[PDB]
Design a protein around this nucleic acid. Structure first.
Ligand code: MG
Ligand code: MG
Ligand code: MG
Ligand code: MG
Length: 50
RNA sequence: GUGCUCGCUUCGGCAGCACAUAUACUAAAAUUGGAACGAUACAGAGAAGAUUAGCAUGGCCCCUGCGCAAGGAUGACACGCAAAUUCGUGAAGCGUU
């Protein structure tokens, strides 16, 4: 019954599931780089990026 | 530069005439930028359970190939809270002309 519910719920394949996780990881690394850049601008250190 | 001048006129010089008439992306440089795999960590291969052949499609994505062949993971990407013009009924409660 548990496998029945878990397979009646699913519609997504491999690539959609890796892209959703990749979007969450991109959001996480964006917030992390945002925090680092906000600290570098808050204390004041003008390191430029590429 | 050379030759000819019944040129001065010596073998020294000068004069005249003739022929000959415009190289070089100008550097042995100074500069200026974008770039070599590939190593560093991470990262993991589509199709509604799982294991999988693939053929396409589109373009500010390319690589290998002489290729209008064929490969590159079906080469990669594409996965979207997929909302575009324009509304009306019926009673019910409350306030108003
Ligand atoms: Mg599958
Ligand atoms: Mg092919
Ligand atoms: Mg395959
Ligand atoms: Mg293809």
């Amino acid at each position: 019954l548990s496998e029945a519910r878990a397979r009646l719920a699913n519609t997504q394949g491999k690539k959609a599931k890796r892209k959703a996780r990749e979007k969450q990881l991109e959001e996480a690394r964006r917030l992390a780089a945002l925090q680092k850049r906000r600290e570098l601008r808050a204390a004041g250190i003008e390191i430029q990026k590429k």
